[PDB]
Symmetry: C2
Subunit: 69 residues, 2 copies
């Protein structure tokens, strides 16, 4: 139905595109791309320290939690 | 209806709480609170340079666009 497709699109817009699973709640402050915290933190801890979207490098001070909804 | 209340809640979560009107697309990087760009930029240009949520001061380098959805 039309209402449900709209719900699905909102859910997708709030969902991390990296895992397609957890909600967006983290920002990389070099490039300002948004993901879930777990995806960014696991990349940081494993030394895969590039933005999943645009490949910009980031370090310990370059990602932080945010709260959208 | 139940579907419509869920849509309304998603819309609200993506909407700037300051104007309750435009979509969230800006972050203050001192405190990491999120608003629309126009609300933050108009506060900056008028020298009302405190976070609408938590009152943290911010300057020219402390707010940037982000793209959620
Ligand atoms: Zn993720
Ligand atoms: Zn990036
Ligand atoms: Zn606003
Ligand atoms: Zn704030």
């Amino acid at each position: 139905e039309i209402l449900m497709e709209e719900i699905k699109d909102y859910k997708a817009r709030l969902t991390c595109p990296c895992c397609n699973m957890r909600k967006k709640d983290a920002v990389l402050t070099k490039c300002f791309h948004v993901f879930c915290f777990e995806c960014v933190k696991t990349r940081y801890d494993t030394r895969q320290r590039k933005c999943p979207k645009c490949n910009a490098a980031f370090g310990a001070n370059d990602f932080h939690r945010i709260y959208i909804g």
